[PDB]
Design a protein around this ligand. Structure first.
Ligand SMILES: NC(=O)c1ccc[n+]([C@@H]2O[C@H](COP(=O)([O-])OP(=O)(O)OC[C@H]3O[C@@H](n4cnc5c(N)ncnc54)[C@H](OP(=O)(O)O)[C@@H]3O)[C@@H](O)[C@H]2O)c1
Ligand SMILES: Nc1nc(=O)c2nc(CNc3ccc(C(=O)N[C@@H](CCC(=O)O)C(=O)O)cc3)cnc2[nH]1
Length: 185
């Protein structure tokens, strides 16, 4: 099928700091992430969330696995899914493979990439339809991990998107904007 990426990025393209988010917790932005990644109208099926190993451990243990979603972790030097994770794959291809194998066949509604820099960079270059759900955190934040540039040659910003607020949001005195990008490539 198609892939969704979801990310929140500072104005300096930061996504991470010290294995956590660069900004303080934004409850309603987290609830947006939860709603977008969890929402599945197909009764009997759940969404697949795919993430790198560091992203997995950046989720507080009490929120692992991400409830109402199939949690799959990518790791090349791990051979059991980390404690609480539903699946492990050695590559994005292997994770997508898994979708049409007995483990996940007719179990998976949508696929959400939530995983770190390398997972996004690869997902973003994957053939077929891609949507990037990008929360623009409209402050600079000190960050050690960054979201790759969005290639405008293939990706276009959609002006609005059904189910996504169009106006700038503000929580805990931090403004942000929900964006959705799309390629057909
Ligand atoms: N929206 C956001 O703001 C957002 C989203 C995600 C993460 N973050 C933040 O970013 C940081 C974590 O992201 P990160 O980029 O540092 O790490 P990450 O991509 O979650 O994890 C890196 C590790 O995951 C595994 N991995 C990554 N790509 C893989 C692939 N294609 N195949 C197999 N395994 C793969 C590797 O593990 P092995 O070494 O075991 O092979 C790699 O060392 C944290 O600070 C987190 O809070 C923020
Ligand atoms: N838009 C967006 N915002 C983010 O903060 C985000 N974070 C990651 C990676 N980090 C995290 C960290 C924590 C949780 C988390 O705790 N999620 C819970 C929230 C539950 C609650 O608020 O009580 C969840 O159920 O989804 C998810 C991803 C990936 N994509 C993102 N995308």
């Amino acid at each position: 099928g198609s892939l969704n990426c979801i990310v929140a990025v500072s104005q300096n393209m930061g996504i991470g700091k010290n294995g956590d988010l660069p900004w303080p917790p934004l409850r309603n932005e987290f609830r947006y992430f939860q709603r977008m990644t969890t929402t599945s109208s197909v009764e009997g099926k759940q969404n697949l969330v795919i993430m790198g190993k560091k992203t997995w451990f950046s989720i507080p243990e009490k929120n692992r696995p991400l409830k109402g979603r199939i949690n799959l972790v990518l790791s090349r030097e791990l051979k059991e899914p980390p404690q609480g994770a539903h699946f492990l794959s050695r590559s994005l291809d292997d994770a997508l493979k898994l979708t049409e194998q007995p483990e996940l066949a007719n179990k998976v509604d949508m696929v959400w990439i939530v995983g770190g820099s390398s997972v996004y960079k690869e997902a973003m270059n994957h053939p077929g339809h891609l949507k990037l759900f990008v929360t623009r955190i409209m402050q600079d934040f000190e960050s050690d991990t960054f979201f790759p540039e969005i290639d405008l040659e293939k990706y276009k910003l959609l002006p609005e998107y059904p189910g996504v607020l169009s106006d700038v949001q503000e929580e805990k005195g931090i403004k942000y904007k929900f964006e959705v990008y799309e390629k057909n490539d």
